[PDB]
Amino acid sequence: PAVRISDGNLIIKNRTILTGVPDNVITTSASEAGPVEGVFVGAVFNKEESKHIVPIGTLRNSRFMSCFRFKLWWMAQRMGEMGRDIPYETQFLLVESNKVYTVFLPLIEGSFRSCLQGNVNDEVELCLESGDVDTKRSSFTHSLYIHAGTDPFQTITDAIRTVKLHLNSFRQRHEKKLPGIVDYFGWCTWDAFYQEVTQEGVEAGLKSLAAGGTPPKFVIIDDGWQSVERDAESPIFRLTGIKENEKFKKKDDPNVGIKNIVKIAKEKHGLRYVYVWHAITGYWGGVRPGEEYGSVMKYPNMSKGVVENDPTWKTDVMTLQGLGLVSPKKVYKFYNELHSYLADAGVDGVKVDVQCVLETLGGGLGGRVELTRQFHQALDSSVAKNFPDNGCIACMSHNTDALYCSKQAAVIRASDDFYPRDPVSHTIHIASVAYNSVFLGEFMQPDWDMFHSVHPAAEYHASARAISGGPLYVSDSPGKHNFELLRKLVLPDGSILRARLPGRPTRDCLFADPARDGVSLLKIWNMNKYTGVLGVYNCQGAAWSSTERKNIFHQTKTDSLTGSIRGRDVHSISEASTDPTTWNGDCAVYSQSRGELIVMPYNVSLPVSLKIREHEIFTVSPISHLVDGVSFAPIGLVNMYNSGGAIEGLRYEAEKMKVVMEVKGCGKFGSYSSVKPKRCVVESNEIAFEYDSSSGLVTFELDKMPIENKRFHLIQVEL
Ligand SMILES: OC[C@H]1O[C@@H](O)[C@H](O)[C@@H](O)[C@H]1O
């Protein structure tokens, strides 16, 4: 049976993972298409309760990685060996048997949501909550799912799909429509102006970016454009109407609102998309109590796991001053009127924020899962009507309540905010995004957030954004730009080189905490179509503290650390080979910063050494062997972080000793060749190239962007 409770012990492929499983902890593997290859888990209790907790079993000497909510809104990573180290509010837990990998997915079930928490006795406990006193239950069959396999990433995905086949209440990332913004550079006003943003600031930020040759094709007008008011210390603000405030009304004709800056953005400055920010509850303090939308004051319910990890939530302005919560009966009316107004003004999407609050406001109304479902149901209906390119970015949304009802939305902020003025944040941001994407990336495309192009950590953030697989945008104040940096990310038409997957830790890094263990470098892998990409980060020296309950610096024993890369760290690198059945695993590896090309045989390590807050990017291309002595691998646009993303087509013709490629973009193009090319041809005309006989690096300039909708350079390399 493979995954079974036998005696009081949890056994997986004949390894004990857990011991001492209570007698009340019930399994089942039946489903519509019966044979389930892992197991659903639940529990019978005595009484009708709105909160429950049962140990699943006792976990010892088994490496894990967990993603846990350090705050209501956001997750971060924790590794350990013992059940006691599992944090409160653990929403995703992956266990290594030493070869074999087990995932534990705490689920929503009816009106209940579960998570994992460790206790002092090393038991893994299942915490079950409705977030509502009037919604109570004694027995559950499907509040956890457990599945195991020998590829950690494939194990995760296979489990998620099985959970999806049970619930039918979400879709996986790859089944959703990505809105078009993800293929372009954007800018977001948040760090530029905070809430003091005006339409004149919008226009200035778009002009300053385009002026330097890296034009954003989307903008996020963030928090600060809505009509909000304090109740009639620090007071909370509530939405007073759905239309823009006076900073977004054309100064000349007060009856023309946000339409003005949209039309300026698009017509005058060439933007393809405009998005705006709003809280899932309208604003931070919700909507002002009123008839129109049924808004009535609600006060956040505290839950233990949340409060345990974030004690400041007890005294937070939202918690103490409440929110005007729009009624479930009128929630669709609210989103629709807001979004209809926005869409009729030419807005293409919304960054929907403060999302987890709903788990704390289910008191009257069905509890946490139900309130979440209802709001998202309405939100998704309005989005599909009003923003039909699927214009929704989910923010502050890292709860299982939301994730398991993520049926439509396709982009999710993967971490806590970029914080330009907080030195502790930068290493942590890189770690959180990477680890969180392991799980969040099964649901939606991770968004690794805005960043500053002018900042000590700019390269560190930007390089990470390049290999993220997600939208790429800055929050630069106007005129504070590093265009040399930006050209590494953004082509002259505003298109980017997006990788195809959520960027994730290598197999290598899944169980070794690169923020805390003091020994390991973080390696992040992604794919393009015909290359892999690998980013290496030192992100030691900071993390959330289990004692201080916040992000701090902590002690590190060296500044510099040495790890290594292998072609195969790029987990799916074989999908980039034009001939995987004959491919012997050899890769061309190009160091983006050092500008160095190395041939790396299958399994040969190359050492990499980095001080804290340093990084390196490598493009990893499968070598094709045309004949004995004629070997080749494309690299792409070598002065861009994700160089391989420029290669759209690749074909080998060994009978003619020829390589045929389709390449997007412009700038310097690089390839590995064992021999000096006879000819390099671009659009039928021979072009000059250089060749470094000792590295095999071939180079030539793709001078301009492809000529008119003819999307690609056609390149022939004759060897
Ligand atoms: O107050 C506005 C801000 O809200 C945060 O939750 C969000 O992550 C930021 O990116 C910005 O939108």
CATH number at residue 235: 3.20.20.70
Q: Which domain holds residue 480?
A: 175-488
Q: Is 51 helix (H, G, I), strand (E, B) or coil?
A: strand
Of all protein residues, the one whose alpha carbon is nearest to atom 11 of ligand 1 is 190
Residue 104 identity: F
- Residue whose CA lies nearest to ligand 1 atom number 9: 417
Q: Which residues of 9-21 are buried (b: 16+ CB within 10 A; e: fewer)?
A: ebbbeeeebbebb
Q: How far apart are CA 489 and CA 259, in angstroms?
A: 30
CA of 512 from ligand 1 middle (Å) equals 30
| Nearest CA-CA partner of 585 in 597, 599, 598, 596 | 599
Query: What is the C-alpha to C-alpha distance for residues 489 and 487, in angstroms, rounded to an integer?
Result: 5
Q: How many whole angstroms separate alpha carbon 96 and alpha carbon 103?
A: 9
Whole-number Å distance, alpha carbon 154 to ligand 1 midpoint, is 33
E strand residue ranges, 542-591: 542-544, 551-553, 560-565, 587-591
Quick one: which atom of ligand 1 is closest to the CA of 284?
1
Residue 597 CB neighbours (<10 A): 24
Sign of the CA dihedral running 104, 105, 109, 113? positive
Instruction: Report how far residue 692's alpha carbon sits from residue 260's, in angstroms, rounded to the nearest whole number.
Output: 54
Distances from the Cα of 289 to the Cαs of 240, 322, 335, 340, in angstroms? Answer: 9, 11, 16, 22
After which residues is the backbone of the chain broken at C–N > 2.5 Å? 98, 232
d(CA 487, CA 529): 22
8 Å CB contact between 28 and 40: yes
* CA of 396, closest atom in ligand 1: 6
Closest C-alpha to 278, from 305, 241, 253, 329: 241
Nearest to 510 by CA among 105, 158, 160, 103: 103
Give the type of residue at 17. I
Exposure string for 667-695, b = 16+ CB within 10 A, e = fewer: bbbbbbbbbebeebbbeeeeeebebeeeb
Query: How many residues make up the chain in this entry?
Result: 719
CA dihedral 45, 48, 52, 53 (to 10 degrees): -10
Q: Nearest 5°: CA angle at 558, between 554 and 563?
A: 110
Considering only CA atoms, which of 115, 113, 107, 117 is closest in space to residue 129?
Answer: 113
3-state secondary structure of 126: strand
Which contiguous run of DSSP H or E holds residue 622? strand 615-622
Closest by Cα among 511, 505, 516, 498 to 427: 516
Distance 419 CA to ligand 1 centre (A): 11
Strands (E), 13-59: 16-19, 27-28, 39-49, 51-59
Among 277, 413, 422, 425, name the best residue to mutate to test ligand 1's pocket (greatest count of ligand atoms within 8 A of Cβ).
277
Task: Identify which of 222, 313, 351 to mutate to test ligand 1's pocket (most ligand atoms within 8 A of the CB).
Answer: 222
CB 452 within 8 A of CB 420: yes
User: How many angstroms separate the Cα of 497 from the Cα of each of 636, 641, 663, 671?
Assistant: 10, 9, 11, 17
Distance 277 CA to ligand 1 centre (A): 8
As given in the structure block, the two tokens for residue 629 are 């002595």
Q: Are 192 and 477 in contact (CB under 8 A)?
A: yes
Nearest CA to ligand 1 atom 2: 223
Residues with CB under 6 A from ligand 1: 190, 222-223, 277, 353, 395-396, 417
What's the CA-to-centroid distance between 352 and ligand 1, angstroms?
10
The CA-CA-CA angle for residues 174, 180, 184, to 5°, reads 115
Q: Which atom of ligand 1 is nearest to the CA of 354?
A: 6
Report the side by side order of strands in the sheet with 624-627: 624-627, 630-637, 667-673, 697-702, 690-692
CA of 135 to the centre of ligand 1 (A): 32
Which CA distances in Å does 584 have to 437, 567, 672? 30, 11, 16
Candidate from 73, 74, 187, 190 with most ligand 1 atoms within 8 A of CB, to mutate: 190
Cα(476) to ligand 1 centroid in Å equals: 15
- Residue 25 alpha carbon to ligand 1 centre in Å: 41
Rounded Cα distance between 134 and 698, Å, is 69
> How far away, in angstroms, is 353 Cα from ligand 1 center?
7
How far apart (Å, rounded) are the C-alpha atoms in residues 35 and 193? 55
Distance 379 CA to ligand 1 centre (A): 19
* Residue 711, both tokens: 């999307």
Which residue has the CA at smallest separation from atom 3 of ligand 1? 223
Ligand 1 nearest atom to the CA of residue 416, by list position:
8
SS3 191: helix
Q: At what angle do helices 331-344 and 367-386 cross, to 10 degrees?
A: 30
Q: Fill in the DSSP letter of residue 520.
A: P
Distance 450 CA to ligand 1 centre (A): 10
What six digits make up the tokens of 702?
Answer: 């793709």
The angle, 0 to 180 degrees and rounded to 10, between the axes of the packed helices 425-440 and 152-167 is 60
**Cα(244)–Cα(556) distance, rounded to whole angstroms?**
49
